[PDB]
Amino acid sequence: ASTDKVDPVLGRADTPFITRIMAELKEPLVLSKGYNIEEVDKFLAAIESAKRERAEL
Amino acid sequence: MSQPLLRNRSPEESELLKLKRNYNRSLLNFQAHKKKLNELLNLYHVANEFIVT
Amino acid sequence: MGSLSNEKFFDISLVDSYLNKDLKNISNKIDSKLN
Amino acid sequence: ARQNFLGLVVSQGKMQKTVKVRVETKVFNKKINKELFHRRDYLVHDEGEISREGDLVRIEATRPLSKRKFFAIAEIIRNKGQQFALYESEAQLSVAKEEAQKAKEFLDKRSVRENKLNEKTTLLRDIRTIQDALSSGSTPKELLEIKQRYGIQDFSQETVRQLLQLDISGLEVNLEKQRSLIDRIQTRLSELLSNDLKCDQFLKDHGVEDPLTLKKNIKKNLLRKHVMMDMQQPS
Amino acid sequence: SSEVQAACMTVRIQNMANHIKEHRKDFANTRNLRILVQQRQAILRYLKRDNPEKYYWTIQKLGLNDAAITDEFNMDRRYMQDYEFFGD
Amino acid sequence: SLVKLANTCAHLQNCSKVRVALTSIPYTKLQLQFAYNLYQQGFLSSLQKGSTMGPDKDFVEVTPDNISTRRLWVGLKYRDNKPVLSSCKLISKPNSRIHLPMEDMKKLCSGVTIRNIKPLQPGELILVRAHNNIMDINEAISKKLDGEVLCRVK
Amino acid sequence: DSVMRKRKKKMKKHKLRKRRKREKAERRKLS
RNA sequence: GGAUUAAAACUAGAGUAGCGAAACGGAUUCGAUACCCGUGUAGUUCUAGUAGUAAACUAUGAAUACAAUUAUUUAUAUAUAUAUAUAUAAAUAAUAAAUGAAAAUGAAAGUAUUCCACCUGAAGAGUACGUUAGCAAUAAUGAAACUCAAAACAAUAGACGG
Ligand SMILES: [K+]
Ligand SMILES: [K+]
Ligand SMILES: [K+]
Ligand SMILES: [K+]
Ligand SMILES: [Mg+2]
Ligand SMILES: [Mg+2]
Ligand SMILES: [Mg+2]
Ligand SMILES: [Mg+2]
Ligand SMILES: [Mg+2]
Ligand SMILES: [Mg+2]
Ligand SMILES: [Mg+2]
Ligand SMILES: [Mg+2]
Ligand SMILES: [Mg+2]
Ligand SMILES: [Mg+2]
Ligand SMILES: [Mg+2]
């Protein structure tokens, strides 16, 4: 009964790796399909800026 | 019969092989990245027809 | 046309040329030629 | 001489100074006409309690040491069992440190995102003031703040272009350089091999002694090592 | 690499286990979960033989122990009751 | 691999039944030594290195880049409406390997059934492996070598 | 086995079932 | 060892149109504890369980290497004078060879290799006893004596067929 009984499927409860990955998926601005918000904000601003420059040539 | 069955890759051949394989993986990642941005651009062009307010 | 296109719905070429100093280094080039 | 066997430690730490060693011997089975391996576990004396489960050891016959013990550990041939114990202890410490660092890098990222959500200012709006103030001449204090939100002290048309740079652009240029190197190395060596005279000279110029007296493989490797030393070291 | 494969299987095992906890009569996907858990054991057993140092590091980070990997596992009804897989 | 050798022996029997003039076998040292012995003993017309698609016309160095696509190509012989290589069977099997001393090999070549191995018949070739070299049993007896009795070809 | 031979096993199974029903009934009355 | 496992059956609680063991009636019949008809209980349904059995069948365990053809679909790829054509796999059908007691099998029931399960005349018998498991019905495991010179399969030619 003193053996370290680790669930062979789910492992030790509160494993830092398992918990952190789960938390990362539930962050406020996580996007799907490989997009990241930071790259999407710059890309959308670049479209506007690029359009203005094309309208100034 | 006297010919060796296998000749191991020279260290130089292994270097050029690694360059091509890294390039192949990098090019596919880049091409997929650019395809996604081109779809994000074509979605921006039509987001004026979508309702959020 | 790519960057130098007239379509309202353009491709990423235009956004790439902007951030790569091409649509600007060509506008100046054309204007310099006009001079 | 004393009978010696080779075996794998299959049990340790259950009895004081005693381990169980699995010895396999080769025997012939007349019925099936096949040379088989016969297995037996030996209770073995470990005076120094050094052996560990998984170790490969040689056991030597001894005087009777107990009702069932007639062999002792004579040498550790391979210490895989001892290695397992050392690596498990290190893993606990090694993983704890890494997880602590990763936990602190996750909370830091969260704080930055929360801080940015407290700044109502948006990239588009900020880039629409740096492009209107730069086209109208107005310099509201917002710009000075914007010169701190982004660090862009100077407000020019070539500063918004450097605020909106996407990593993909850098990748596109690194990929062209990678492709160039490969293409150049192949053309160079391809041409060199086509011309034996230019090949012999090539080797001598790069410091080869009498390259003429070399084999195709013994010398093509030199050419490959040189072509890749003239397009990767100079660059 | 075996460590990467085990980590990738861990993500799917965690997701599949959550599904089973809400669909306890979905025996088809319970069978899939069992096989996936057993596949992870096999890859890690090879890792222990190939690179023992990496093996112990990997299982520690994934939240498992040597016993969970080496011991025969069937994810049977006794396991579902001894570890309260479904709760109550 | 004795399993690979069993696959080759069965493959050659299948090819003989349909009377194909040319077939391929896996490219390995054991396979090459096996085929070479058959060639020198007159069971095979030709033995060429090649690829999955056919024998090489010009020498092609084998490297890790193409090892997976290498094959050995052997030509089968047929005379008087009969296949020269009719049967090809292993003696030492994957699940029961037979190692014989030179004394027992001499008995096998003398009409004595050793360890259930039927004795050598007229015109039959029995191959033996010793120190990763394949040779005829009569040659192993000449060199006083002990080895594994691999297969018998007739 | 053919239907003809299966029929012999069928008869043996029927007689065993008939006997066990008969025994059951007795237990009920004797209980 | 573990898990899942038709129908029937059982435990508890709901449901119950239709169908329908049983039971009670109507017919048929020399008789009719049947086939047909009526009234129709359990059951068939749902929820939570027990149980682990079928001609649970392809009566054909799984894996790998290999061997001569055609036809038909499907998939991927290639080409163009752009809709076909050319390739490579898979599936199915009919076959060569081979195998087989034959019926036939045909990419296996062929040529080989590896591992597991199982069989050793019929009947007695998947019975008896014991044990284990189950609420229970039962399920698993599983004999011997006595008796006999039988017993079985494929195919052949008949005879016969409401
Ligand atoms: K003692
Ligand atoms: K009802
Ligand atoms: K069937
Ligand atoms: K089996
Ligand atoms: Mg596996
Ligand atoms: Mg039978
Ligand atoms: Mg009920
Ligand atoms: Mg009725
Ligand atoms: Mg059940
Ligand atoms: Mg039964
Ligand atoms: Mg059965
Ligand atoms: Mg069925
Ligand atoms: Mg499988
Ligand atoms: Mg029974
Ligand atoms: Mg018959």
Q: Quickly tell me which residue has 């001079």 as its tokens.
A: C35
Q: What burial letters (b/e) apply to D59-82, b meaning 16+ CB within 10 Å?
A: bbeeeebeeebbbbbbebeebbbb
Helix (H, G, I), strand (E, B) or coil at E50: helix
Mention every residue, 6+ apart, whose C-beta is less than 8 A from residue B3. Answer: F59
Minimum CA–C1' distance nucleotide for G8? H123
The three state secondary structure string of D118-162 is HCCCCHHHHHHHCCCHHHHCCCCHHHHHHHHHCCCCCCCHHHHHH
C24 contacts D164? CB cut-off 8 A? no
Find the radius of gyration of the CA atoms of chain G.
14
Are chains E and F in contact at 3+ CB pairs closer than 8 Å? Answer: no
Resolution (angstroms) stands at: 2.6
Q: Would residue E65 be called left, alpha or beta, if left means φ above 0 and alpha means ψ between -120 and 50 degrees? A: beta
DSSP string, F76-111: E-EETTEES---EEESSBTTB--EE-HHHHHHHTTT
Beta bridge partners of D19: D44
Which amino acid makes up residue B40?
L
Give the residue on D whose Cα is nearest the Cα of A29: D113
Q: In whole angstroms, what separates CA D18 from the centre of its chain?
A: 40
Beta bridge partners of D44: D19
Spatial distance between the Cα atoms of F128 and F139, rounded to a whole number of angstroms: 9
DSSP string, D182-224: HHHHHHHHHHHHH-HHHHHHHHHHTT-SSTTS--HHHHHHHHH
Q: Residue F18 CB closer than 7 angstroms to strand H? A: yes
Contact yes or no for D61/D88 (Cβ under 8 A):
no
Residues of C with CB under 8 A from a CB of A: 3, 10, 14-15, 17-19, 23-24, 26-27, 30
Spatial distance between the Cα atoms of E68 and D88, rounded to a whole number of angstroms: 14
Closest residue by Cα to residue D226 from D212, D199, E21, A47: D199
Q: Quickly tell me which residue has 């090592």 as its tokens.
A: D225
Find the radius of gyration of the CA atoms of chain A.
22
Task: Show residues of chain A in contact with B44, CB under 8 Å.
Answer: 44, 47
Spatial distance between the Cα atoms of D113 and A27, rounded to a whole number of angstroms: 10
Contact yes or no for E37/E75 (Cβ under 8 A):
yes
Q: How many angstroms is C1' of H99 away from CA of F14?
A: 14
Dihedral sign computed on CA atoms, order E15, E17, E21, E27:
positive
Cβ of residue B8 closer than 8 Å to a chain F Cβ: yes
E63 contacts A18? CB cut-off 8 A? yes
Cβ of residue D87 closer than 8 Å to a chain E Cβ: yes
Q: How many angstroms is C1' of H30 away from CA of G28?
A: 39
Closest residue by Cα to residue D54 from D10, D114, D98: D10
Closest residue by Cα to residue D106 from A16, F106, F63: A16
E61 contacts D98? CB cut-off 8 A? yes
Spatial distance between the Cα atoms of D5 and D74, rounded to a whole number of angstroms: 10
Which amino acid makes up residue A26?
K
A45 vs chain E: nearest CA distance in angstroms?
Answer: 35
DSSP state of A20: H
Task: Count Cα atoms within 13 angstroms, Cβ side, for D74.
Answer: 13
Of all ligands present, the nearest one to the C-alpha of G5 is: 6
Q: In whole angstroms, what separates CA D221 from the centre of its chain?
A: 27
Question: Which residues of G spanning 1-31 put their CB closer than 7 angstroms to strand H?
Answer: 1-6, 8-9, 12-13, 16-17, 20, 24
Tell me which of B12, B13, B27 to substitute to probe the interface with D (most D C-beta atoms closer than 10 Å): B12
